[PDB]
Amino acid sequence: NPFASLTLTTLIILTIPIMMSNSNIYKTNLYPNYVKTTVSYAFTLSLVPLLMFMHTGQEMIISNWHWMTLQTVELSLSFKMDYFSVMFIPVALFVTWSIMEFSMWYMHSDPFINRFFKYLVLFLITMMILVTANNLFQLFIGWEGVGIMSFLLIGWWHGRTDANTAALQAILYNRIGDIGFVLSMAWFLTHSNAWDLQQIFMLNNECPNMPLIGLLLAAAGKSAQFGLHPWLPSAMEGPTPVSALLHSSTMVVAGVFLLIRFYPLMETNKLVQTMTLCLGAITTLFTALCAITQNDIKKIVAFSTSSQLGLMMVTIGINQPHLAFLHICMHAFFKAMLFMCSGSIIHSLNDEQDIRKMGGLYKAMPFTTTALIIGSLALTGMPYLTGFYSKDLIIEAVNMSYTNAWALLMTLIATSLTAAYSTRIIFFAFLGKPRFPPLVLINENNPLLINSIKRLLIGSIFAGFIISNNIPPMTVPNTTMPLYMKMTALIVTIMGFMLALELNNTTYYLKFKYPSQTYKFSNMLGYYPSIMHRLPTYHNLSMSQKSASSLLDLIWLETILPKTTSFIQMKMSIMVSNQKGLIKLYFLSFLITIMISMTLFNYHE
Amino acid sequence: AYLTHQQKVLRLYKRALRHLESWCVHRDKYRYFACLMRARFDEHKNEKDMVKATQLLRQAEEEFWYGQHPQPYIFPESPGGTSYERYECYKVPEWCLDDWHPSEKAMYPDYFAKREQWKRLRRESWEREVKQLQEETPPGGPRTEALPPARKEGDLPPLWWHIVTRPRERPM
Amino acid sequence: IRWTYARSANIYPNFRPTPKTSLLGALFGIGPLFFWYYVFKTDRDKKEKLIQEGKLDQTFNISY
Amino acid sequence: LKIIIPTTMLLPMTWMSKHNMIWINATVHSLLISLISLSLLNQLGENSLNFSLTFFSDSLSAPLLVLTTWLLPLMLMASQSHLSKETTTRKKLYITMLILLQLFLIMTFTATELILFYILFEATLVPTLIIITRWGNQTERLNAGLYFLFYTLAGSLPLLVALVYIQNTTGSLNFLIIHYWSHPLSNSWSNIFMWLACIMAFMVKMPLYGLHLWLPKAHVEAPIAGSMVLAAVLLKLGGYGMMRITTILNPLTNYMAYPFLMLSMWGMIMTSSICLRQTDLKSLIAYSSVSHMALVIVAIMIQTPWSFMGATALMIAHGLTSSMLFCLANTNYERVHSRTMILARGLQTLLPLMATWWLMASLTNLALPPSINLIGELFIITASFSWSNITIILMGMNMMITALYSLYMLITTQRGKYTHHINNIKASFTRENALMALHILPLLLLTLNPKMILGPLY
Amino acid sequence: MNVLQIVRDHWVHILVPVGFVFGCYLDRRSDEKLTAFRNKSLLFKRELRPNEEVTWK
Amino acid sequence: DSWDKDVYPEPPRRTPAPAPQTSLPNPVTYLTKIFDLLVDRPVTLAREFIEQQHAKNRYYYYHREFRRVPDITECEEKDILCMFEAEMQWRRDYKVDQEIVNIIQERLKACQQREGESYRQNCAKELEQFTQVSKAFQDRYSDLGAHYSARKCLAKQKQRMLAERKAAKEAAA
Amino acid sequence: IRLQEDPDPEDENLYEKNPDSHGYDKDPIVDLWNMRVVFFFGFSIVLVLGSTFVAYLPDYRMQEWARREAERLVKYREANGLPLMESNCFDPNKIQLPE
Ligand SMILES: CCCCCCCCCCCCCCCCCC(=O)OC[C@H](COP(=O)(O)OCCN)OC(=O)CCCCCCCCCCCCCCCCC
């Protein structure tokens, strides 16, 4: 009985700050603190549904208000309380509340801080009704509200045209993904004759070829997988809290959240899983490959996010939906720390964000030092931490299954690279010598930072256990396996630590570095942004003018029908009016008209 | 107008070792290869022959394009930096001020009173500076974008308002 | 102002019906229209052929 | 019937009123007549609302008239930017044309006879070319009138010959009578041309890829009042016609639809792609209107229940937003005295509220959920997908471009860095901001219960 | 305030409201001419109550 | 209750007895009791105040029954008079049948979630009911197009009868 | 002279006479009244009271009527065991089967 009311309030009470903002009663200053309290109180409100869940396990559907009685179709406002929904809510509110604390630290000179916090809340609503959506239309409501707000959020400072370019690029790649979303809606409404998710599961589409690939394409959009990946690394162009919240822990994982919510239908078709293993594999290799040799402080970790996304959707690839949801909570915990920690050192280091000028901050900023090391260790899978309970359990699961041959080697090799850039980011940014500008203004003693990092810090240390034990067993436990690949989830990260450490040390060895061809490949993001953002965009839009606008509309279409008939009347209307005026010529013509009438054509005859 | 033989090598050096800093990262590593870059730069100082000197430009640039960092390092405030034209969101031109409502300009009376005086200086010095300009322009307009200074006392340097009243680099 | 005229109004005053414009106009004009005609008609007759003896499944396809 | 007499009654209203009260008196009574019009969505079930021998209403017309009756106040305050300096008689005659325009559109939708519909359908032209040519701004507004009218009559006139032919054959063309006394259309060669004549008239006032040269040649140069009314309701006159005339054009519609819906299908990607490469701001909405208008061409052609609902939903929603982007075009054009896109940039740092209206306008035209643009467009996709599975790759690829040019205008005009030499933009009056508000609020607050908008098939 | 003036200025807004009441009259004036099947539809054949005399007007 | 538990049937609900074997206090028991004794009671007092006020005056509404009229089949050809009434009943039946499939869908909608992980078994009968409802609905109004009518539905009805009778005749031999 | 022509007048921005202008006309008091009248006869009545006019509209295409006389019709059938909706809308016994 309580379950319906408490979770619904967690949605409703999240929107009052938006309406108060429109009321303009807030006299600035207090508004960001007012927003934080609402989100924090939303989190505390969101607990008691979660503690309810493990006690019994009840999962409800809260279809409340009827929208369309569209013949046999019954569109209504429907929220599905399920394990994926009721558990992701406090995790989502936890990260967004702590970073709401962080946003005041970083942006204190921003004159539009109130608009920023309002934007953060408005996204939270659009994501909230996405994660808890029972009918597909509400999923699109979240699917599109979140994408639009990215365009507003990472395009915060309109300012530099590169920010708008990232805004146009991010929405365009997201625009490509939802083409499959619309395809799935058309297929479900036509064949399954419904849009609510649970009815589609009931009707048992045992051969859902077209809807599933469209759903896979939709996930490829928001999760920034191959084809549609480069919008994630370019999304760093906005404020770091935007990049720390939206597309590091919350938005990008929402694409993966679509496939898991459709898992009861997905596993029926064996073929649809082969590209999920295919897509997630190569994405992990490529995104980690770029992160190895990148330099921007946010580029390294942003690529790590996409590499993580490829890893977790590989799991739902090999019949591991719930384990993907297990990763959805751990990854949102420590990855926010890594971005928030980078945001902290950016602000202290006179907004400098290139590892070549970091270094020596291990002792200058110890609190951020401790957070990143144990944050990265969770990211690398330190046993009995938040990361290990998901990542290494996943590796133990994927390698032991009927899957594509090499497809188990990215998640093996990428994990080695996953640990590799973690060592590089630790070595360059914090270890080494202090290569930063001589004037030191660094400081992290503000309590707003210390509490913000600490809130997820005990999370990034102790969450792993407090989700692993309480949740009911919903996957088959891997019990008997060989020793080598059961430990390989931990071994692989060891040479990831080892080889990268030696390679990072090569910078200490005093000898010039030759530019390798493979190094050049990794520095340009693997050449994808250089080409795909130059050739296809130029050719299609050049056609929009040379062929589309100038050739057809302005020339051809307007010269075929209208101007031809205009000229046809024009061409010989001249001598229709141009007559010499001689009575001879007029009356001679009257002669011919007489003869043609009664002799040649002979109307009489 | 001209990037003569002097500046070309000066710019070439600037982009050369800045890329080297992007390569060596570590200060001790950078300093060794910087002085080698410097020592190898002036080992052929006495190269009176300009044809060889222009030739020495050729082996300076083509391997610079090969040797440049594929991820070149740029400071935030300079072209390509992470903070270029970041604060244009806040830089509003000065002319928007007079549109403020009587309540809005009574909000800050002293600044508007001083702003009015600033408007005065432009008004009765404009005709002086354009006249000063005209009598010193060469025939067929100016042959160089550089502006002449204030010839005599009192008159402000010609065409001065916007370059002086330019919005601050850190407006907020 | 010159750029606006050149890209908006001047195209036809200086247009010439040279042969090249005809192939470009035909290829980018009725070309794709007939190409989509081949694709769409083929599926439509194929779909109509399949349903008329009932191979296509419409057990729950009612919301047409 | 209770709408028409007050609508005519505004004719003495504006023509007599005091020199300075003509706009005040006209604005209020246009606002009050939205009352009696608002009682037209008030509707029975499947049976249409027939309240007179010659006038009738249904769930397809009902959204249309309440759009037009609502619309006229929008062009009233819209014209209160550049009609101030004109003489009183010219100012009064501008209202005369707008009020005369209302009297026509308010009567075509209620017409229960095909010819009476057609008589008033093409009668709306006469008020238009007065607006475009007399009160136009640029030079080629003269060529605008010829392009607009000649395109319309070249298709409308064969429809008149078709209508009287149906009059002689079956006996009557009352919209109910033809529905109840339906007759399948044989595949005879003569019926093909009769079908083509019946449809072509509504096609030309439904910008099709090739029959759309008057779309950029009329909307761009028309006055602000004429621009929205020509784009919000006038384009919909064919939309009402095709939804009604298709009742007597079956089964010939399905076989004959391939040359037409496909041309709309391919051109709707092309026309949207045109907006990606544009130099004139007002040309964006004109071409964007063509792509959006051509979307419902497919919907009506399929004659699918879902398609008709989506067509009506997009029909009104597109008209509301396309009018809005024309208001935002006017304010920027008035301040800068030019229609070039790239001239006025970085306007958001000067007019923050106007940027928000620009944001809402382009984002609604983007057709996000739950906005009426999306639900109208989504219903078309589902109906088209049922007709053919490949339809998603085309009409979906339109949504590709649709999001692009919608944000392109927002970025290059509002976002970015302001151009320094423009010293003309003042703070926006309460007029345009209220004008934008009166455009955006009815669209948003209709989203909660849009079942007045889906149509009779709902 | 000079009732004759205030009416010479504000009497204009009379003939649009009466235009509305003019319309509903001819709306209502048109109905009774159109009625030819009062209680004659087979789907509504309600017996005419003794107190009343007309099904609808 | 307000509805009927035969057209909106609800399977009987079985909830286990709370048997906390552990000694540490159960938190969930605490949240419900504070919830019930701090929020559930005040809204109940507000509701009972509403109900007694709603019982002060009692206005009623009733059901609009429509008597049967001849359909378009027995309707005379070209006879507009009875055609309008025949068309009216046909579309009103369309609305009724549209609600019938809505009721089955809602029954089907509730069944799957209520059965949860075992939705394949205790909802098979619900799936069968939806299958024949959907199949018969396609035999009824479907594919007629945007301008559907009683005559067009009768046309499809005749088309099925000619096809099925001919097929049965040749198959029987 | 080429052609005797008045120069193009400048844009008389409405704020310069009255900074409290409303962009509706030149006269101040009518400008104030113009804002009041369109805001009141607009936003107030047609937008709010117009909303509840059609939001609280009576049963639209008798939607409630259709739902509530659907449970009774379905209840009749399965009680006697015959299907809750037939596959033949019009009755099949009386329809004339051609030849
Ligand atoms: C039902 C009958 C309706 C018609 C008769 C009654 C009309 C009045 C209705 C109530 C109005 C309440 C508010 C009145 C404010 C009056 C302010 C005023 O006197 O303004 C006058 C002025 C024009 O100049 P002047 O008249 O010379 O006065 C100033 C001299 N220095 O400045 C001005 O701005 C002139 C006035 C502008 C217009 C004001 C609104 C007129 C219309 C009001 C009714 C609209 C609705 C009608 C239908 C209602 C029922 C549906």
Side-chain angles (χ1 to χ4, degrees), chain B residues 60-118:
Chain B
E61 43 81 27
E62 81 302 32
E63 43 98 43
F64 148 73
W65 198 257
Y66 189 39
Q68 57 187 20
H69 201 158
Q71 244 279 8
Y73 185 31
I74 176 59
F75 273 10
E77 277 322 299
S78 158
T82 179
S83 85
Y84 200 119
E85 46 175 19
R86 153 192 288 285
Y87 301 104
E88 316 318 277
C89 158
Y90 318 125
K91 318 172 151 194
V92 46
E94 57 91 13
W95 83 306
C96 187
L97 271 193
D98 43 8
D99 213 331
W100 286 37
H101 190 269
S103 86
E104 315 192 60
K105 46 207 165 63
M107 202 56 267
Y108 314 82
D110 313 295
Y111 178 38
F112 271 87
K114 287 171 120 324
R115 193 213 201 284
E116 193 265 3
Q117 202 62 30
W118 264 109

Side-chain angles (χ1 to χ4, degrees), chain G residues 28-79:
Chain G
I29 182 58
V30 191
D31 281 331
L32 205 177
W33 278 123
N34 205 156
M35 143 188 304
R36 301 233 153 219
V37 63
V38 69
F39 267 70
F40 172 51
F41 277 121
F43 303 130
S44 80
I45 39 184
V46 294
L47 242 193
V48 201
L49 330 179
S51 77
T52 169
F53 194 130
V54 317
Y56 272 130
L57 248 200
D59 205 0
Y60 186 31
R61 52 268 321 290
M62 61 285 298
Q63 215 35 64
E64 135 63 12
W65 170 98
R67 179 48 73 84
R68 69 97 175 63
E69 70 190 74
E71 309 113 348
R72 44 161 70 171
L73 281 293
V74 61
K75 186 143 44 55
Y76 203 135
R77 273 139 176 130
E78 71 305 23

Side-chain angles (χ1 to χ4, degrees), chain D residues 14-304:
Chain D
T14 181
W15 212 90
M16 142 174 191
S17 317
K18 205 183 297 319
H19 154 232
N20 36 45
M21 301 325 158
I22 72 169
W23 294 90
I24 324 287
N25 306 2
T27 314
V28 307
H29 301 129
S30 47
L31 282 191
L32 285 304
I33 55 89
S34 36
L35 268 307
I36 321 90
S37 88
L38 205 45
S39 72
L40 282 208
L41 320 90
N42 203 358
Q43 169 116 9
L44 162 53
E46 46 276 64
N47 169 38
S48 165
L49 198 44
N50 308 261
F51 29 66
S52 94
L53 191 33
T54 181
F55 286 167
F56 93 116
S57 163
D58 86 273
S59 182
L60 164 66
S61 304
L64 267 305
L65 319 88
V66 312
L67 185 46
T68 85
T69 38
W70 172 254
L71 212 51
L72 187 292
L74 289 324
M75 311 86 78
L76 269 196
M77 336 164 260
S79 276
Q80 220 72 339
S81 46
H82 69 282
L83 270 293
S84 59
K85 74 203 61 52
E86 280 255 86
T87 199
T88 304
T89 37
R90 281 189 277 276
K91 230 173 304 307
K92 297 224 200 165
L93 226 66
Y94 201 103
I95 324 281
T96 325
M97 291 305 78
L98 300 173
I99 295 286
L100 202 83
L101 207 44
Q102 197 158 340
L103 181 48
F104 287 156
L105 291 323
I106 209 55
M107 251 197 299
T108 83
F109 294 136
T110 42
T112 190
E113 188 29 28
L114 257 283
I115 287 100
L116 168 60
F117 166 76
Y118 167 88
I119 296 328
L120 309 184
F121 158 44
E122 159 218 318
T124 80
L125 261 44
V126 192
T128 59
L129 319 90
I130 298 316
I131 298 177
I132 293 96
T133 47
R134 175 46 144 111
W135 282 280
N137 268 297
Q138 282 310 317
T139 286
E140 80 314 353
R141 78 208 212 237
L142 279 316
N143 210 344
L146 311 209
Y147 260 76
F148 169 49
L149 159 48
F150 280 125
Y151 261 82
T152 316
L153 288 200
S156 85
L157 255 58
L159 183 287
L160 169 60
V161 194
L163 282 205
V164 289
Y165 166 78
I166 295 135
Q167 177 57 350
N168 310 343
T169 51
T170 179
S172 152
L173 318 86
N174 169 276
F175 288 78
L176 298 135
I177 287 304
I178 47 185
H179 182 293
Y180 290 107
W181 281 357
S182 199
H183 278 353
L185 246 195
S186 99
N187 212 349
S188 184
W189 267 133
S190 302
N191 298 358
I192 319 299
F193 278 99
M194 192 255 277
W195 191 102
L196 203 143
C198 263
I199 296 283
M200 206 36 88
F202 311 115
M203 301 315 258
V204 55
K205 196 168 306 190
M206 191 86 48
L208 195 61
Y209 190 59
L211 304 182
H212 65 180
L213 270 311
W214 65 278
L215 256 286
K217 213 70 54 53
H219 294 57
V220 173
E221 31 260 59
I224 296 92
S227 314
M228 341 190 287
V229 70
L230 153 78
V233 59
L234 250 170
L235 294 209
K236 320 303 173 142
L237 265 206
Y240 183 61
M242 278 187 3
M243 226 92 59
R244 303 293 219 202
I245 192 49
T246 325
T247 48
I248 81 185
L249 297 163
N250 291 45
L252 189 44
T253 319
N254 55 38
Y255 150 72
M256 192 46 38
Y258 290 84
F260 289 159
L261 61 89
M262 271 219 307
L263 176 55
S264 161
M265 248 189 229
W266 178 245
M268 92 162 288
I269 286 160
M270 191 85 48
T271 43
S272 46
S273 167
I274 303 276
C275 329
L276 258 206
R277 185 84 89 96
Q278 218 62 54
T279 168
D280 164 285
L281 188 275
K282 289 202 57 176
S283 162
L284 230 44
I285 321 90
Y287 272 111
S288 98
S289 90
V290 177
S291 91
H292 274 327
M293 213 57 257
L295 185 41
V296 306
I297 291 173
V298 192
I300 308 199
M301 281 335 297
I302 316 301
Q303 332 158 82
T304 279

Side-chain angles (χ1 to χ4, degrees), chain F residues 135-150:
Chain F
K135 155 167 302 312
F137 215 129
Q138 297 188 56
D139 313 344
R140 277 141 99 105
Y141 333 120
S142 91
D143 167 87
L144 301 62
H147 309 293
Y148 43 68
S149 66

Side-chain angles (χ1 to χ4, degrees), chain A residues 202-221:
Chain A
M202 171 36 58
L203 179 288
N204 270 66
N205 315 0
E206 328 283 17
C207 296
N209 192 231
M210 270 315 109
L212 257 49
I213 169 162
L215 282 196
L216 179 274
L217 174 59

Side-chain angles (χ1 to χ4, degrees), chain D residues 223-454:
Chain D
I224 296 92
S227 314
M228 341 190 287
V229 70
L230 153 78
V233 59
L234 250 170
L235 294 209
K236 320 303 173 142
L237 265 206
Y240 183 61
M242 278 187 3
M243 226 92 59
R244 303 293 219 202
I245 192 49
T246 325
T247 48
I248 81 185
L249 297 163
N250 291 45
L252 189 44
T253 319
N254 55 38
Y255 150 72
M256 192 46 38
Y258 290 84
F260 289 159
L261 61 89
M262 271 219 307
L263 176 55
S264 161
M265 248 189 229
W266 178 245
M268 92 162 288
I269 286 160
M270 191 85 48
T271 43
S272 46
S273 167
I274 303 276
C275 329
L276 258 206
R277 185 84 89 96
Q278 218 62 54
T279 168
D280 164 285
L281 188 275
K282 289 202 57 176
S283 162
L284 230 44
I285 321 90
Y287 272 111
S288 98
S289 90
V290 177
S291 91
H292 274 327
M293 213 57 257
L295 185 41
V296 306
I297 291 173
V298 192
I300 308 199
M301 281 335 297
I302 316 301
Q303 332 158 82
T304 279
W306 266 253
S307 81
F308 268 36
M309 311 205 258
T312 316
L314 188 275
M315 205 143 43
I316 311 294
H318 158 271
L320 256 174
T321 179
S322 314
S323 41
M324 171 175 277
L325 285 302
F326 272 141
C327 329
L328 301 130
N330 159 69
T331 75
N332 299 29
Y333 163 70
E334 161 46 10
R335 280 145 179 83
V336 84
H337 274 346
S338 210
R339 256 186 337 253
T340 307
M341 183 113 92
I342 217 73
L343 197 57
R345 315 176 301 285
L347 257 58
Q348 154 188 84
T349 85
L350 289 322
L351 309 185
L353 192 57
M354 282 294 336
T356 315
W357 303 133
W358 270 101
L359 182 293
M360 268 323 189
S362 35
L363 157 52
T364 41
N365 164 70
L366 204 171
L368 80 168
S371 64
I372 317 299
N373 294 311
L374 189 269
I375 61 192
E377 180 298 351
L378 184 40
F379 288 168
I380 295 193
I381 299 274
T382 61
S384 89
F385 182 69
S386 147
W387 180 74
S388 166
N389 290 345
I390 297 82
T391 57
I392 179 61
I393 203 45
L394 284 175
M395 295 169 20
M397 186 166 173
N398 157 250
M399 153 211 302
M400 191 36 48
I401 314 297
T402 305
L404 266 282
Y405 63 78
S406 315
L407 273 40
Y408 171 49
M409 48 205 317
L410 186 46
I411 289 147
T412 185
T413 57
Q414 313 300 265
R415 283 163 169 287
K417 154 70 73 156
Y418 75 96
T419 177
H420 314 286
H421 72 96
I422 61 76
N423 74 278
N424 287 5
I425 288 109
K426 313 301 153 218
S428 78
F429 327 114
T430 189
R431 161 161 60 72
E432 54 276 56
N433 299 263
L435 174 72
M436 272 56 166
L438 275 196
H439 269 234
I440 185 53
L441 287 148
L443 191 45
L444 271 283
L445 80 77
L446 199 145
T447 319
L448 304 307
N449 155 15
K451 71 188 174 37
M452 335 293 142
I453 272 283
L454 290 207

